[PDB]
mmCIF file of C-alpha atoms in Angstrom:
data_model
loop_
_atom_site.group_PDB
_atom_site.id
_atom_site.type_symbol
_atom_site.label_atom_id
_atom_site.label_comp_id
_atom_site.label_asym_id
_atom_site.label_seq_id
_atom_site.Cartn_x
_atom_site.Cartn_y
_atom_site.Cartn_z
ATOM 1 C CA UNK A 403 0.000 0.000 0.000
ATOM 2 C CA UNK A 404 1.470 3.318 1.136
ATOM 3 C CA UNK A 405 1.948 3.251 4.929
ATOM 4 C CA UNK A 406 5.149 1.211 5.009
ATOM 5 C CA UNK A 407 6.599 3.375 2.234
ATOM 6 C CA UNK A 408 5.964 6.765 3.800
ATOM 7 C CA UNK A 409 7.082 5.441 7.176
ATOM 8 C CA UNK A 410 10.269 3.694 6.040
ATOM 9 C CA UNK A 411 11.111 6.852 4.080
ATOM 10 C CA UNK A 412 10.471 9.240 6.979
ATOM 11 C CA UNK A 413 12.032 6.767 9.383
ATOM 12 C CA UNK A 414 10.514 5.692 12.686
ATOM 13 C CA UNK A 415 9.076 2.271 11.772
ATOM 14 C CA UNK A 416 8.521 1.356 15.433
ATOM 15 C CA UNK A 417 5.693 3.904 15.431
ATOM 16 C CA UNK A 418 3.996 1.516 12.976
ATOM 17 C CA UNK A 419 4.822 -1.855 14.532
ATOM 18 C CA UNK A 420 3.683 -0.716 17.979
ATOM 19 C CA UNK A 421 0.500 0.821 16.572
ATOM 20 C CA UNK A 422 -0.331 -2.314 14.626
ATOM 21 C CA UNK A 423 0.325 -4.575 17.598
ATOM 22 C CA UNK A 424 -2.132 -2.393 19.500
ATOM 23 C CA UNK A 425 -4.651 -2.720 16.673
ATOM 24 C CA UNK A 426 -4.134 -6.482 16.965
ATOM 25 C CA UNK A 427 -4.649 -6.695 20.717
ATOM 26 C CA UNK A 428 -7.714 -4.441 20.597
ATOM 27 C CA UNK A 429 -9.233 -6.397 17.700
ATOM 28 C CA UNK A 430 -8.517 -9.581 19.648
ATOM 29 C CA UNK A 431 -10.170 -8.437 22.863
ATOM 30 C CA UNK A 432 -13.100 -7.523 20.612
ATOM 31 C CA UNK A 433 -12.947 -11.132 19.346
ATOM 32 C CA UNK A 434 -12.789 -13.109 22.597
ATOM 33 C CA UNK A 435 -15.775 -11.049 23.658
ATOM 34 C CA UNK A 436 -18.826 -12.047 21.590
ATOM 35 C CA UNK A 437 -16.793 -15.211 21.095
ATOM 36 C CA UNK A 438 -15.857 -16.098 17.518
ATOM 37 C CA UNK A 439 -12.922 -17.970 16.019
ATOM 38 C CA UNK A 440 -11.046 -17.826 12.704
ATOM 39 C CA UNK A 441 -9.396 -14.377 13.064
ATOM 40 C CA UNK A 442 -10.780 -11.784 10.664
ATOM 41 C CA UNK A 443 -8.957 -10.774 7.497
ATOM 42 C CA UNK A 444 -7.995 -7.363 8.912
ATOM 43 C CA UNK A 445 -6.095 -9.017 11.762
ATOM 44 C CA UNK A 446 -4.313 -11.311 9.312
ATOM 45 C CA UNK A 447 -3.375 -8.351 7.125
ATOM 46 C CA UNK A 448 -1.998 -6.425 10.096
ATOM 47 C CA UNK A 449 -0.012 -9.480 11.176
ATOM 48 C CA UNK A 450 1.454 -9.615 7.680
ATOM 49 C CA UNK A 451 2.311 -5.916 7.829
ATOM 50 C CA UNK A 452 4.116 -6.316 11.153
ATOM 51 C CA UNK B 157 -12.393 21.513 55.484
ATOM 52 C CA UNK B 158 -11.211 18.512 53.454
ATOM 53 C CA UNK B 159 -13.940 16.299 54.970
ATOM 54 C CA UNK B 160 -17.656 16.972 54.522
ATOM 55 C CA UNK B 161 -20.257 14.982 56.464
ATOM 56 C CA UNK B 162 -23.955 14.853 55.590
ATOM 57 C CA UNK B 163 -27.058 13.534 57.329
ATOM 58 C CA UNK B 164 -27.056 10.293 55.329
ATOM 59 C CA UNK B 165 -24.911 7.250 56.088
ATOM 60 C CA UNK B 166 -23.443 6.301 52.704
ATOM 61 C CA UNK B 167 -21.725 9.654 52.133
ATOM 62 C CA UNK B 168 -20.456 9.638 55.730
ATOM 63 C CA UNK B 169 -18.769 6.289 55.094
ATOM 64 C CA UNK B 170 -17.603 7.351 51.624
ATOM 65 C CA UNK B 171 -15.743 10.343 53.051
ATOM 66 C CA UNK B 172 -13.786 7.970 55.297
ATOM 67 C CA UNK B 173 -12.001 4.754 54.362
ATOM 68 C CA UNK B 174 -14.796 2.422 55.516
ATOM 69 C CA UNK B 175 -16.799 3.324 52.378
ATOM 70 C CA UNK B 176 -16.736 -0.165 50.820
ATOM 71 C CA UNK B 177 -16.652 -2.274 54.003
ATOM 72 C CA UNK B 178 -20.404 -2.146 54.743
ATOM 73 C CA UNK B 179 -21.258 -4.760 52.089
ATOM 74 C CA UNK B 180 -22.071 -8.361 52.941
ATOM 75 C CA UNK B 181 -19.895 -9.614 50.073
ATOM 76 C CA UNK B 182 -17.183 -8.119 47.899
ATOM 77 C CA UNK B 183 -18.077 -7.413 44.287
ATOM 78 C CA UNK B 184 -17.080 -9.997 41.700
ATOM 79 C CA UNK B 185 -16.016 -10.253 38.079
ATOM 80 C CA UNK B 186 -16.300 -14.034 37.561
ATOM 81 C CA UNK B 187 -19.786 -14.550 38.986
ATOM 82 C CA UNK B 188 -21.372 -12.982 35.939
ATOM 83 C CA UNK B 189 -23.213 -15.781 34.075
ATOM 84 C CA UNK B 190 -21.706 -14.365 30.854
ATOM 85 C CA UNK B 191 -18.014 -14.220 31.797
ATOM 86 C CA UNK B 192 -18.092 -17.893 32.754
ATOM 87 C CA UNK B 193 -19.499 -18.699 29.311
ATOM 88 C CA UNK B 194 -16.623 -16.910 27.576
ATOM 89 C CA UNK B 195 -14.033 -18.607 29.779
ATOM 90 C CA UNK B 196 -15.605 -22.007 29.137
ATOM 91 C CA UNK B 197 -15.603 -21.316 25.394
ATOM 92 C CA UNK B 198 -11.905 -20.423 25.476
ATOM 93 C CA UNK B 199 -11.113 -23.574 27.454
ATOM 94 C CA UNK B 200 -13.142 -25.727 25.056
ATOM 95 C CA UNK B 201 -11.334 -24.073 22.145
ATOM 96 C CA UNK B 202 -7.930 -24.866 23.628
ATOM 97 C CA UNK C 17 -31.724 -5.629 61.436
ATOM 98 C CA UNK C 18 -29.305 -8.362 60.288
ATOM 99 C CA UNK C 19 -26.107 -7.060 61.883
ATOM 100 C CA UNK C 20 -22.875 -9.064 61.740
ATOM 101 C CA UNK C 21 -19.329 -8.869 63.091
ATOM 102 C CA UNK C 22 -18.126 -6.948 60.032
ATOM 103 C CA UNK C 23 -21.115 -4.576 60.021
ATOM 104 C CA UNK C 24 -20.495 -3.854 63.721
ATOM 105 C CA UNK C 25 -16.709 -3.530 63.703
ATOM 106 C CA UNK C 26 -16.966 -1.182 60.727
ATOM 107 C CA UNK C 27 -19.521 0.857 62.692
ATOM 108 C CA UNK C 28 -17.340 1.269 65.754
ATOM 109 C CA UNK C 29 -14.492 2.624 63.638
ATOM 110 C CA UNK C 30 -16.864 5.041 61.902
ATOM 111 C CA UNK C 31 -18.005 6.340 65.279
ATOM 112 C CA UNK C 32 -14.468 6.660 66.641
ATOM 113 C CA UNK C 33 -13.192 8.439 63.530
ATOM 114 C CA UNK C 34 -16.149 10.823 63.259
ATOM 115 C CA UNK C 35 -15.068 12.111 66.688
ATOM 116 C CA UNK C 36 -11.282 12.007 66.280
ATOM 117 C CA UNK C 37 -11.357 13.745 62.900
ATOM 118 C CA UNK C 38 -13.601 16.333 64.571
ATOM 119 C CA UNK C 39 -11.139 16.993 67.382
ATOM 120 C CA UNK C 40 -8.547 17.881 64.725
ATOM 121 C CA UNK C 41 -11.136 20.258 63.193
ATOM 122 C CA UNK C 42 -10.864 18.392 59.883
ATOM 123 C CA UNK C 43 -14.585 17.556 59.654
ATOM 124 C CA UNK C 44 -17.301 20.069 58.795
ATOM 125 C CA UNK C 45 -20.692 18.820 59.991
ATOM 126 C CA UNK C 46 -22.909 21.859 59.509
ATOM 127 C CA UNK C 47 -25.403 19.968 57.340
ATOM 128 C CA UNK C 48 -26.076 17.767 60.366
ATOM 129 C CA UNK C 49 -26.371 20.556 62.922
ATOM 130 C CA UNK C 50 -28.778 22.209 60.478
ATOM 131 C CA UNK C 51 -31.286 19.507 61.322
ATOM 132 C CA UNK C 52 -31.623 20.001 65.102
ATOM 133 C CA UNK C 53 -30.994 23.561 66.278
ATOM 134 C CA UNK C 54 -30.912 25.772 63.182
ATOM 135 C CA UNK C 55 -34.233 24.624 61.627
ATOM 136 C CA UNK C 56 -37.390 26.380 62.767
ATOM 137 C CA UNK C 57 -38.081 23.442 65.105
ATOM 138 C CA UNK C 58 -36.229 25.552 67.679
ATOM 139 C CA UNK C 59 -38.586 28.500 67.071
ATOM 140 C CA UNK C 60 -41.824 26.934 65.809
ATOM 141 C CA UNK C 61 -41.908 24.506 68.735
ATOM 142 C CA UNK C 62 -41.574 27.491 71.049
ATOM 143 C CA UNK C 63 -44.398 29.126 69.081
ATOM 144 C CA UNK C 64 -46.461 26.018 69.865
ATOM 145 C CA UNK C 65 -45.621 26.092 73.564
ATOM 146 C CA UNK C 66 -46.468 29.812 73.644
ATOM 147 C CA UNK C 67 -50.057 28.840 72.789
ATOM 148 C CA UNK C 68 -50.428 25.480 74.525
ATOM 149 C CA UNK C 69 -49.374 27.086 77.813
ATOM 150 C CA UNK C 70 -52.120 29.677 77.325
ATOM 151 C CA UNK C 71 -54.674 27.034 76.348
ATOM 152 C CA UNK C 72 -53.786 25.225 79.586
ATOM 153 C CA UNK C 73 -55.014 28.224 81.626
ATOM 154 C CA UNK C 74 -58.752 27.777 80.968
#
């Protein structure tokens, strides 16, 4: 896409890994609640980005 | 005056430390009949 | 009713501390004194005695 390009150009990639790990934990606490399995595609995409 | 006392009893306790010690049982987070369902689902998944 | 050891021990401490924290002048309890002396029950009751005492003379 464009996020990893703008970030790796402007430096500070940790500001992206930490933010995506937070968007993984939050989207996982919103998955254990109202219990479902088979993690959504957005979580898989963020895991690939990290 | 850092402490204000009123005619009622709950606010009088709340001003002091004893506020939460007038209950017959301490509040709970695992007695909810929904939390136990989620925990049992996670255990069955594992 | 239905008092227990915890409900009683936590009541003794509340009574001891209401007094100790009042000796140190840390407690303001004017919204409790404005239920006994300051309300008109100090004056209206006297305005009821001022007429019952006169009704009791005939």
